[PDB]
Write a protein that binds this ligand. Sequence first.
Ligand SMILES: CCC(=O)Nc1cccc(N)c1C
Ligand SMILES: CCC(=O)Nc1cccc(N)c1C
Length: 166
Amino acid sequence: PKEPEQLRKLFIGGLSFETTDESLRSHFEQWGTLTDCVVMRDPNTKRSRGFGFVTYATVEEVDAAMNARPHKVDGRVVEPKRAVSHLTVKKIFVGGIKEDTEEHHLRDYFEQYGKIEVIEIMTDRGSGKKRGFAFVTFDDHDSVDKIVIQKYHTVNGHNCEVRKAL
Ligand SMILES: CCC(=O)Nc1cccc(N)c1C
Ligand SMILES: CCC(=O)Nc1cccc(N)c1C
């Protein structure tokens, strides 16, 4: 039961034009087994396009690589991002939390995806009653990228709808 390959890929932007399949692989093999590693090049000149992708054997390895950012590859800090499900944001909408979900429920759950900077539990402008949804802002986009590819989110017993926000 191998995780889908799309969820094991990291797109690496900002490459040095000197980076090769081999040097990209040598770098990212520090955090797991790479089943694929390619630097994108022009079909005619073979000059690097400045980006490429690596595929790990497992999702846990993708996490390890993301948690080892910043990555300086061949002298240049690169920009790894998980493959598209790129709309790169740090904020999520959390819906379906009803009136009884509080800040600590959302924090205790989502803090295991990344570092939380803001939790905004939405209330009615007129009555102050909870509206049943919230926004969570993290310090970095990978948290959000991990969150929105999950099929399910269970918080405070509620089955929640979670999507990228703005
Ligand atoms: C940093 C060196 C570099 O850009 N390499 C390069 C330049 C022009 C053509 C081709 N094919 C290649 C590999
Ligand atoms: C496996 C990924 C993981 O545990 N989550 C993570 C990664 C990086 C920063 C922070 N704060 C957190 C909670």
